[PDB]
Design a protein around this ligand. Structure first.
Ligand SMILES: CC(C)[C@@H](NC(=O)[C@H](CS)NC(=O)CCC[C@H](N)C(=O)O)C(=O)O
Ligand SMILES: [Fe+2]
Length: 328
């Protein structure tokens, strides 16, 4: 019933060289991360009007033929190499949500991780240029725009924890990041299929159940339709929508590294019968990236938790999320 306190943080100093101003941003990241776990990043420099318009044009013009040709393995047995990247189909009358996921544009057939067949690395699939002119160029450019924003955010998290600003960002590299963009369409449907609505223990109608994120951080743009709720000790609280800002939260890899000092907030998606967009960028590191866990509450920072390689974390995490909350 209540509304979550989600502050709006001007992140523009993180692109600059005024070190005190960066510290003032870091303090606000720290405070939000220790409270509900969510904040809006504002003054971020990304053209989100164009993001939303180009995503809508793609979602509304793609045909069933094209969806089959781009489908991940869960929907097309022919595409055994597409576990992450491709189209995630809706099922008329049963499943409302549909989406398109793409990975690092640098993952080509000649990339060494692709040649080694390393798990979680795939080459992106794209629609025909002539049916969707400019879409691939836009989407690859967007990847690097949100990469740049995420790199700056990571400097803020580092300073917030008392570390040098490259503590996380040094592991977040264009040549090997496992980060993904997902372009999700939540449709207006009348009648809305009952199989696509889940009922929470507390009676709330949901589109996606409670979870912690599989990410270091999650950088999310959504249309202006309220849908997210965050769990607190006193129950779920509504996150108000803001279609000019990016909603930021930590994933479970951050909670692991920090001995839960920055928790991964549990959140869920309420069912709303409205046409809307949900466009997450999941900040993932490289396959071999390892950050030694530390405990910010302890003077010496010592913690007993085992270091975890990002690749093993991600592979287990994505499968666990499918098993718990369903194939999307
Ligand atoms: C809550 C939003 C981020 C969005 N949900 C989501 O994106 C949910 C929960 S964080 N995320 C996932 O299913 C993980 C997708 C991972 C992606 N295929 C990849 O290979 O990297 C929604 O609107 O449902
Ligand atoms: Fe999430």
């Amino acid at each position: 019933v209540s509304k979550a306190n989600v502050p709006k943080i001007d992140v523009s100093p993180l692109f600059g060289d005024d070190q005190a101003a960066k510290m003032r941003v870091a303090q606000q990241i720290d405070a939000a991360s220790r409270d509900t776990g969510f904040f809006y990043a504002v003054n971020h420099g990304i053209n989100v009007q164009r993001l939303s318009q180009k995503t809508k044009e793609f979602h509304m013009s793609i045909t069933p033929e094209e969806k089959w040709d781009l489908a991940i393995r869960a929907y097309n047995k022919e595409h055994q190499d597409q576990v992450r990247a491709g189209y995630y189909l809706s099922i008329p009358g049963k499943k409302a949500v549909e989406s398109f996921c793409y990975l690092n544009p640098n993952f080509t057939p000649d990339h060494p991780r692709i040649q080694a067949k390393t798990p979680t690395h795939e080459v992106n699939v794209w629609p025909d240029e002539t049916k969707h002119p400019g879409f691939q160029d836009f989407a690859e450019q967007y990847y690097w725009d949100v990469f740049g924003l995420s790199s700056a955010l990571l400097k803020g998290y580092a300073l917030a924890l008392g570390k040098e600003e490259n503590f996380f960002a040094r592991h977040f590299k264009p040549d090997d990041t496992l980060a993904s963009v997902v372009l999700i369409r939540y449709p207006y449907l009348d009648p809305y299929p009952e199989a696509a609505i889940k009922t929470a223990a507390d009676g709330t109608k949901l589109s996606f159940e409670w979870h912690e994120d599989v990410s270091l951080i999650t950088v999310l743009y959504q249309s202006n339709v309220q849908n997210l709720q965050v769990e607190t000790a006193a129950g779920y609280q509504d996150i108000e929508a803001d279609d000019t800002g990016y909603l930021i939260n930590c994933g479970s890899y951050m909670a692991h590294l920090t001995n839960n000092y920055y928790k991964a907030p549990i959140h869920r998606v309420k069912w709303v019968n409205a046409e809307r967009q949900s466009l997450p960028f999941f900040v993932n590191l490289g396959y071999d990236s390892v950050i030694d866990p530390f405990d910010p509450r302890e003077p010496n920072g010592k913690s007993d938790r085992e270091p975890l390689s990002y690749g093993d974390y991600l592979q287990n995490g994505l499968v666990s999320l499918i098993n718990k909350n369903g194939q999307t």
